[PDB]
Swiss-Prot record, chains A, B, C, D, E:
Ranges of the Sequence repeats in the UniProt entry: 19-33, 34-44
Taxonomic classification: Eukaryota, Metazoa, Chordata, Craniata, Vertebrata
Transmembrane portions of the chain: none
Function according to Swiss-Prot or TrEMBL: Neuronal protein that plays several roles in synaptic activity such as regulation of synaptic vesicle trafficking and subsequent neurotransmitter release. Participates as a monomer in synaptic vesicle exocytosis by enhancing vesicle priming, fusion and dilation of exocytotic fusion pores. Mechanistically, acts by increasing local Ca(2+) release from microdomains which is essential for the enhancement of ATP-induced exocytosis.
Subunit structure: Soluble monomer. Homotetramer. A dynamic intracellular population of tetramers and monomers coexists normally and the tetramer plays an essential role in maintaining homeostasis. Interacts with UCHL1. Interacts with phospholipase D and histones. Interacts (via N-terminus) with synphilin-1/SNCAIP; this interaction promotes formation of SNCA inclusions in the cytoplasm. Interacts with CALM1. Interacts with STXBP1; this interaction controls SNCA self-replicating aggregation. Interacts with SNARE components VAMP2 and SNAP25; these interactions allows SNARE complex assembly and integrity.
Gene Ontology terms for molecular function: actin binding; alpha-tubulin binding; beta-tubulin binding; calcium ion binding; copper ion binding; cuprous ion binding; cysteine-type endopeptidase inhibitor activity; dynein complex binding
The protein's name: Alpha-synuclein
Annotated positions binding Cu cation: H27
Stretch forming the signal peptide: none
Name of the gene: SNCA
Modifications after synthesis and translation: Phosphorylated, predominantly on serine residues. Phosphorylation by CK1 appears to occur on residues distinct from the residue phosphorylated by other kinases. Hallmark lesions of neurodegenerative synucleinopathies contain alpha-synuclein that is modified by nitration of tyrosine residues and possibly by dityrosine cross-linking to generated stable oligomers.
Associated disease: Genetic alterations of SNCA resulting in aberrant polymerization into fibrils, are associated with several neurodegenerative diseases (synucleinopathies). SNCA fibrillar aggregates represent the major non A-beta component of Alzheimer disease amyloid plaque, and a major component of Lewy body inclusions. They are also found within Lewy body (LB)-like intraneuronal inclusions, glial inclusions and axonal spheroids in neurodegeneration with brain iron accumulation type 1.
Tagged with keyword Nucleus: yes
Full-length numbering of the shown residues: 14 to 100 of 140
Length: 77, 77, 77, 77, 77
């Protein structure tokens, strides 16, 4: 008997300028696992079985990695 | 008996300029796994079995990777 | 007995300029797996079995990868 | 009998300028695991089975990694 | 009989400038594990099974890693 929830109830000369803005937002992520079986055997690699939530307004940079999940970088410069 | 939920109830001279804006937003991601079986055997690679939520307003950069999930980079420069 | 849900109920001289805008938005992603079996054997590659949600307003960059899921880059420059 | 929840109830010459802004925000992440079995055998790699929540306004930097989960970097410069 | 919750109830010539702003915020992360079994055998790698919450306004730096979870860095310069 399992559950995961995210709720938002609202039982209810102005001048907005650049306001009430959402920029790079993650909201309401619900996840359940029940009676799951997992066998990982990893060798030199990347395994991701979980929950990842990345919220970013700005990522500047030449050759930047802004959000990586399960990433194997093996470059030769 | 499994469940995952995300809800939003609203039982209810202005001047908006660039306002009430959503930019790079992830909202309401529900996921369930029950009685699942997984066998991963990974060697030098990338395996992603989970939940990923990436919300980004801006990613500037020559040769940038803004959002990578299960990525194997092995370049030769 | 499995379920995943995302709901939005609304039991209810203005001047909008560039307002109430959605730009790069992911909303309402529901996923279920029950009694699934998976055998992955990965060697030097990328396998993605999960849920990915990428929301991006802007990604500038010569040779940029904005959103990659299950990507094998092995260039020779 | 398991549950995880995140709620927000509101039973209810102005001038906003650049205000009430959300920038790089993670909100409402609910996760449950019940009667799950996991066997990880990792050798020189990265395995991520948990919950990750990254919220970043700005990440500047040439060759920067802003948010990495399950990342194997083995470059040769 | 297990539960984890995060709630926020509000049973209720101004001039905002750059105010009521959220920048790099993590809010409301609920997680439960019941009757889970885990066997990790890690050798020279990184395994992350727990809960990580990173909230950062700014991370400047050429070659900076702003938020890493399960990261194996073995570069050769």
């Amino acid at each position: 008997g399992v559950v995961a929830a995210a709720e938002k109830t609202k039982q209810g000369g102005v001048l907005y300028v650049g306001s009430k803005t959402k920029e790079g937002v993650v909201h309401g992520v619900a996840t359940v696992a029940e009676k799951t079986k997992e066998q990982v055997t990893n060798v030199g690699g990347a395994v991701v079985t979980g929950v990842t939530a990345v919220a970013q307004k700005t990522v500047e940079g030449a050759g930047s990695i802004a959000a990586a999940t399960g990433f194997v970088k093996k470059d030769q410069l």
